[PDB]
From Swiss-Prot, chains A, B:
It is linked to Defects in PPARG can lead to type 2 insulin-resistant diabetes and hyptertension. PPARG mutations may be associated with colon cancer. This is Peroxisome proliferator-activated receptor gamma. Belongs to the nuclear hormone receptor family. NR1 subfamily. It comes from Homo sapiens (Human). Rosiglitazone binds at Q83, F84, R85, S86, H120, H246, Y270.
Length: 274, 274
């Protein structure tokens, strides 16, 4: 490999995406890692029902039912907390996408479709940044909720987070940093096979350039990590499977859980998804 | 890039896989392409219900219902023909997999799981070899059935082939040959994320070597095809979506079609799939 104007353009694209990533996502992997080990945040640990209640400042929730079984109340509060986070993350990701060169010039309907299918895949990708073996950072790093506490929630609420943790353990072993992730998340957004796209070629033309930039970024940033580009591309399949499973759980809740409606933005995203 | 003992080993692996591919799959892409343009096969074209009946030698079927509406009879005969082909293709692919170096040494349960999830993905990959814009080769190249005839079958039978054709048009535009496909299909079989695998690392260790071989094969065989490795890896996601859709259609048939049971081998493959 040589350092030439083609490669320098690919590095400039990588930097542009990194800079927009920093602007769009306040809690980066670097910041999260600093917390999980050295920082200005000292998160309160939620590891059981008591500590979920003794630290109610972290979880946002409201319209809270005094008279119901504790196991149910706790599950519904956690679910509302994830719903609040998801709506905020959608706004971060849509802001980021606007900085992807060429994206805002695509047909508006395709921009919508690309974000409709991309956003949850990116949410779960970036959630791994906030996860370790023990648990997940929440509330902009002010809390840390354990994996085993989340697994212990009343059926079926206890099934929601475990597939994201399983993904994160293997994904975090790739040791990606924010500079890598900024490009990877752009590659996900510019996926030409989303249902109902109108003009695939302008999308794939952008994606191909992002793939070139990602390939170079990994070579430079990960010496001796064999086939990291291919291993990372294959993670895009895992993300779709996580979405599929998550949708099926959300429906179980809809079917057997009154007094729970999705935020209208999430409803819009999920309506006619696949 | 240099020609050295590491690269020569990767070419030797590519050749080993090609040789086994030739031994396992009698109707290769090269042979199919020769037919679709120059060959010893002159397929009969099935383009409408009459020609489906005027050329009943091609389609295997049996236990054939005289007294029923023609649109239904034709659909059930086509469905039985695909079922016969599928059972034969499963046997070809399982034979091939045994030649993948290291595969037969994996735990037997994981060998089963890898083939359980791999086989239909490989069937649809290789079906594209037999497809052009107009239709698909059948009965070892003795027939050619049009895409529009298959789309015209009685609802819901008319929905089955169209997603495979859509995949094939875009996949065939990558211009892969049999030497490329032999390695790609091995990469699919050695996917470490299949449900219920016991030892993932020995699988991913084989897959990583296959990916190295595939990457080199594409560089050598496809000058100026930009990002072909990444574009091809992303096709593995499409294949899973085809399987998902196909399963959902098979169930529609099961629900609203008496006197149709799957061949027991396909039943085994589909049982507890996902
Ligand atoms: C676990 N965690 C980190 C953020 O996790 C996310 C986990 C998932 C999501 C995506 C989001 N999920 C939900 C949306 C609406 C309602 C429930 C969920 C759940 O996901 C859920 C359901 C039942 C039980 C548990 C969770 C979506 O689909 O948009 C967004 C964020 C928390 C927990 C408490 C407070 C804040 N942070
Ligand atoms: C179209 N074609 C090429 C082979 O195509 C395949 C298309 C699909 C398959 C996979 C296979 N499919 C079936 C299995 C059982 C019953 C029906 C199907 C159909 O796929 C089907 C159903 C309804 C209507 C039409 C098809 C599987 O799941 O194992 C294997 C082969 C034909 C057609 C007639 C005879 C032979 N070749």
């Amino acid at each position: 490999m040589q350092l030439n104007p083609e490669s320098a353009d690919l590095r400039a694209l990588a930097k542009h995406l990194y800079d927009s990533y920093i602007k769009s996502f306040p809690l980066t992997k670097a910041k999260a890692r600093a917390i999980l080990t050295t920082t200005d945040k000292s998160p309160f640990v939620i590891y059981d029902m008591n500590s979920l209640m003794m630290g109610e400042d972290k979880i946002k929730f409201k319209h809270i039912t005094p008279l119901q079984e504790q196991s149910k109340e706790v599950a519904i509060r956690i679910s509302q907390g994830c719903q609040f986070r998801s709506v905020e993350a959608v706004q971060e990701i849509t802001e980021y996408a606007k900085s992807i060169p060429g994206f805002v010039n695509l047909d508006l309907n395709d921009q919508v479709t690309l974000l409709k299918y991309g956003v949850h895949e990116i949410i779960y990708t970036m959630l791994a940044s906030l996860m370790n073996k023990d648990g997940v950072l929440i509330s902009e790093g002010q809390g840390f909720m354990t994996r085993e506490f989340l697994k212990s929630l009343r059926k079926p609420f206890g099934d929601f987070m475990e597939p994201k943790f399983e993904f994160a353990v293997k994904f975090n072993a790739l040791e990606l940093d924010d500079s890598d992730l900024a490009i990877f998340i752009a590659v996900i957004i510019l996926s030409g096979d989303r249902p109902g796209l109108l003009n695939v070629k302008p999308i794939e033309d952008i994606q191909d350039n992002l793939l070139q930039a990602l390939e170079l970024q990994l070579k430079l940033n990960h010496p001796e990590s064999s086939q990291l580009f291919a291993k990372l591309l294959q993670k895009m399949t895992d993300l779709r499977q996580i979405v599929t499973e998550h949708v099926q759980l959300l429906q179980v809740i809809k079917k057997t859980e009154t007094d729970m409606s999705l935020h209208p933005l999430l409803q819009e995203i999920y309506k006619d998804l696949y």
